[PDB]
Every structure is written in C-alpha cells, then in structure tokens.
Design an enzyme around this catalytic site. Structure first.
Site, PDB file in Angstrom:
ATOM      1  N   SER A  46       0.789  -1.225   0.000  1.00  0.00           N
ATOM      2  CA  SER A  46       0.000   0.000   0.000  1.00  0.00           C
ATOM      3  C   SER A  46       0.827   1.283   0.000  1.00  0.00           C
ATOM      4  O   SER A  46       0.237   2.362  -0.142  1.00  0.00           O
ATOM      5  CB  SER A  46      -0.935   0.087   1.205  1.00  0.00           C
ATOM      6  OG  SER A  46      -1.997  -0.814   1.073  1.00  0.00           O
ATOM      7  N   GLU A 144      -3.811  -7.214  -6.849  1.00  0.00           N
ATOM      8  CA  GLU A 144      -2.799  -8.076  -7.467  1.00  0.00           C
ATOM      9  C   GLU A 144      -1.383  -7.605  -7.161  1.00  0.00           C
ATOM     10  O   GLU A 144      -0.449  -8.421  -7.115  1.00  0.00           O
ATOM     11  CB  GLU A 144      -3.019  -8.139  -8.983  1.00  0.00           C
ATOM     12  CG  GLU A 144      -4.220  -8.962  -9.400  1.00  0.00           C
ATOM     13  CD  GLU A 144      -5.556  -8.217  -9.389  1.00  0.00           C
ATOM     14  OE1 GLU A 144      -5.603  -6.993  -9.142  1.00  0.00           O
ATOM     15  OE2 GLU A 144      -6.580  -8.887  -9.667  1.00  0.00           O
TER      16      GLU A 144
END
Length: 269
Positions: A46, A144
């Site tokens: 992230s 992904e």
C-alpha cells in the site's frame, strides 16, 4: 563521507526477524544518512498510495477543479479493505476525499479509482519519473500488486528512492507550496502507522507517514517525514520482506529499525 558515520545492528535485527530489512534515512540539515540494503528492491504494497496522492496533487496544479470533483462508483469498484469508500458507495466522494482515504486508511477502492484517473500504474510511474525517480515502478492494481514474489521487480522500489522522492514531494520543490502542505497534512493524518515509524518518534514531534502491508512473504513497510523540534526534518523509509510465503510481517521490527536509524543519525529521541 556522511553515510553510516555510526554503525547500527541492522543485521542482527533482520536475522531475528527472519528476513531482510531495508532502511534509508536522511538528515535534511546536514545531509547525513543511514543506509542498510537501501538500494535493494522491496514490494511497495500500500505504500504506493502516498505517491498516488502526490501525483493527484501535482495534476491539481493544472486542474483547479480536480480535488473537489465528485466521483461516483459502483459496488464493482469496492475492493477488500475499503473502509472509507464503502461508507459512501451510495453518495460518491470527491477526488480529495478519495486521496485522503487512500493515504490515511489505505483504502483500496479509492486507490484504484485514483489510479484510473492518472492512467493506471504506468501513469503513476510516469509521475515518479517526472520528479527524477528512476527506481519506482508500479505495474499492477489493487489487490494483485501485493503478491510480493521473491525476485519479482513488479510493484517495487528501493528504500533510498522512496526516501528521496518523499523528500522532494514533502520538503523540496516537486509540488507547489499549497499542494506540498496538503500532501504533508494527509500524511500527518494517517491512521494506520501507529505501531511503525511513529512508535519510534517522540509524541512532541510532528510526523507524517504511509504504511504498506502485502499480507505475504513477511512484507511490510512504512515511510515518513519527521520534524524533531529544534533541528531539520528527517526523511526515512523502512521496508521488509522474508523468504517464505507464509512468513509473518512485524510492526515491531519496523519501529525498531526506525529507532536504529534515528540513533545512527544522532537524533536524540
């Protein structure tokens, strides 16, 4: 000459963790640095979402109405871990709100919506190239991009390039001054990093950060800008990975590595 003036036990720390730790910390006053595996690639997870928000802010310099543009989305846009955007599915959110959610809650639906605005992973990569970062690459979308496969350069950067780009965007001239402060403010408001770099930073110092957690291969990270009182700010990045798919990440190891980086820079905490 000013790199690793004081050695710190990063090797013992990563051995206890059972993986690899990458660290690059910059004292913006003197230019002194702490560097350990700093040019190795690690998965972004992230953590790309901070740079994503910076890229949106850069675009907003040429598009004054961008940040307040209302974005509607369907249930098909929800991705697992979208804690903010799921509460506004029936109303929409502005670009600025999506950017804050991506930074401060790691919101995945918000991140994918903003990636689409920028032209996908290649568009975010192009923004990073435009500020002089030749290392960063984003290749895939959420979720992904979290596969964190050993040896796979997709969706990776280095601790050094992360720190250098973070410095340019939060303290340097890569963003105009209003956008720069908005990026800083989003990072300062992050909610996901209390157990990472922030755990090594005294409560009376200002700090903004963006975390990453891939969920596999012991892979997690954090980068931050830190303002110790009475001296120049510090920019640093701490990335981890481990050899086995089911190896656990550790927030404590990230905090410990940040402490060692501050110690190596001679920043009293």
């Amino acid at each position: 000459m000013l790199t690793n003036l004081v050695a710190e036990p990063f090797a013992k720390l990563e051995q206890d963790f059972g993986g690899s730790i990458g660290v690059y910390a910059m004292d913006t006053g003197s230019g002194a640095t702490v560097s350990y595996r700093a040019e190795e690639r690690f998965p972004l997870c992230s953590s790309f979402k901070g740079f994503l928000a910076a890229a949106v802010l850069a675009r907003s310099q040429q598009q004054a109405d961008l940040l307040d543009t209302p974005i509607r989305y369907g249930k098909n846009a929800l991705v697992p871990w979208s804690p903010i955007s799921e509460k506004y599915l029936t109303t929409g959110m502005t670009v600025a709100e999506l950017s804050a959610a991506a930074v401060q809650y790691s919101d995945n639906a918000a991140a994918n919506l903003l990636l689409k605005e920028l032209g996908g992973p290649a568009g975010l990569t192009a923004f990073m190239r435009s500020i002089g970062d030749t290392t960063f690459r984003l290749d895939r979308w959420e979720l992904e991009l979290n596969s964190a496969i050993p040896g796979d350069a997709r969706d990776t950067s280095s601790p050094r390039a992360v720190t250098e780009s973070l410095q340019k965007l939060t303290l340097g001239s890569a963003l105009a001054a209003p956008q720069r402060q908005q990026f800083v403010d989003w990072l300062k408001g992050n909610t996901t990093g209390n157990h990472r770099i922030r755990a090594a930073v005294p409560a009376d110092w200002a700090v903004g950060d963006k975390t990453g957690t891939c969920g596999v291969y012991g892979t997690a990270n954090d980068y931050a800008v830190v303002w110790p009182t009475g001296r120049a700010p510090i920019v640093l990045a701490v990335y981890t990975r481990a050899p086995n798919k089911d190896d656990k990440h550790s927030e404590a190891v990230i905090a410990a590595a940040a402490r060692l980086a501050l110690e190596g820079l001679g920043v009293n905490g």
